[PDB]
Amino acid sequence: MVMTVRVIAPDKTVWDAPAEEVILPSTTGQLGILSNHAPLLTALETGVMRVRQDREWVAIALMGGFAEVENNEVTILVNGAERGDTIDLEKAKAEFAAAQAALAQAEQGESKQAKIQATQAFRRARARLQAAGGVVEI
Amino acid sequence: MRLVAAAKVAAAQEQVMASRPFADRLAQVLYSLQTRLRFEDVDLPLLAKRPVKTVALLVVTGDRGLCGGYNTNVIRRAKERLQELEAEGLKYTLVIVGRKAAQYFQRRDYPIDAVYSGLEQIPSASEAGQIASELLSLFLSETVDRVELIYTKFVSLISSKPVVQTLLPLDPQGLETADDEIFRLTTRGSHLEVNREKVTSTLPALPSDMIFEQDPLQILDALLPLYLNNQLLRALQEAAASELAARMTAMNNA
């Protein structure tokens, strides 16, 4: 009835607590993990994970990485992670829209560097709004 | 005169310890990925080896200024590396940590892609990631063909010096060598010293029956940005350890 869930960033463990269920933003879709799952390795996109410790949900924005699940240990390695409780949903809607436009603008442009920069910002702002607002499809 | 220098020694040593779980896990997954992929034959953007016509140089300095020739030595070695590249007919662009060093290079007409605040005493993984994203945007756009960095690092138990290393392309041989070297900082006398030890990875290999949700190549590709950020952050923690060493030196000379 228990998994231990750990999110590990390059400088520190960001999350470490028991959970009944975790939703992982894998590169091929949202993965749903319950207790006693067979061992698994997956890539993680920049997006939102969710953790249910008892009956409520907690969302965390993840900046890409991978996850292993083995013997009721879920270990998540990401370049960065932010608790959705920390993100102002109005602000994150604002930023997502702004990054959306800046990305559209870079794409009209000539500079591959700018396209990459703006894509990086766009993905980060997406994952932050998914985590603030809880809806994946935006 | 205060003993709180040891407090920042211990806070730094804490962050360095806190970085180990990440590197241990990176290593564990890399090890198991090796049993499905020949790393040397992997073709992925962060491993691309283009004929090198342009180089990005990351220059790591601090903005707090009382550390002897800590910053001066970095700045001089970077100037020298850039002269070497120019002699070879290579183009370059600078990414500078430290605003005063950015100004030194600006006044001398060097090309500067990006500037960041001087190295902070306990370097953040978000600090590292902002720099890394910028180096990715130079390298993956093929604006440059190699990314080097220059930073100060302990090379003996007592002494540190600027070093010149390569960040991108990633090195397959680095991907196969696990995070072996861990280093502990310690104030001994009124000077600061580093000891480095080899550690056997504490955790086992991944189960044989483990499911790969995506093809191994795609999992490796998702890992490579983490490896990069681990390498960059480790260099920044080395640079900060060296700067604390230099700043203690400067204190006790007075």
Swiss-Prot record, chain A:
Family classification: Belongs to the ATPase epsilon chain family.
GO CC annotations on file: plasma membrane-derived thylakoid membrane; proton-transporting ATP synthase complex
InterPro entries assigned: ATP_synth_F1_dsu/esu (IPR001469), ATP_synth_F1_dsu/esu_N (IPR020546), ATP_synth_F1_esu_C (IPR020547), ATPsynth_dsu/esu_N (IPR036771)
Name the UniProt record assigns to this protein: ATP synthase epsilon chain
Main location: membrane
GO terms, molecular function: ATP binding; proton-transporting ATP synthase activity, rotational mechanism
Pfam name, any one: ATP-synt_DE_N
Biological function: Produces ATP from ADP in the presence of a proton gradient across the membrane.
Keywords: ATP synthesis, CF(1), Hydrogen ion transport, Ion transport, Membrane, Thylakoid, Transport
Protein location: Cellular thylakoid membrane
Curated annotation (Swiss-Prot), chain B:
Membrane topology: Peripheral membrane protein
Record GO cellular component, one term: plasma membrane-derived thylakoid membrane
Main location, first listed in the record: membrane
Location(s) in or outside the cell: Cellular thylakoid membrane
GO-annotated molecular function: ATP binding; proton-transporting ATP synthase activity, rotational mechanism
Key words, A-Z: ATP synthesis, CF(1), Hydrogen ion transport, Ion transport, Membrane, Thylakoid, Transport
Quaternary structure, from the entry: F-type ATPases have 2 components, CF(1) - the catalytic core - and CF(0) - the membrane proton channel. CF(1) has five subunits: alpha(3), beta(3), gamma(1), delta(1), epsilon(1). CF(0) has four main subunits: a(1), b(1), b'(1) and c(9-12).
Annotated function: Produces ATP from ADP in the presence of a proton gradient across the membrane. The gamma chain is believed to be important in regulating ATPase activity and the flow of protons through the CF(0) complex. The complex from the organism is particularly stable to disruption and remains functional after 6 hrs at 55 degrees Celsius.
Family according to the record: Belongs to the ATPase gamma chain family.
Name recorded for this polypeptide: ATP synthase gamma chain
Shown residues in whole-protein numbering: 24 to 277 of 315
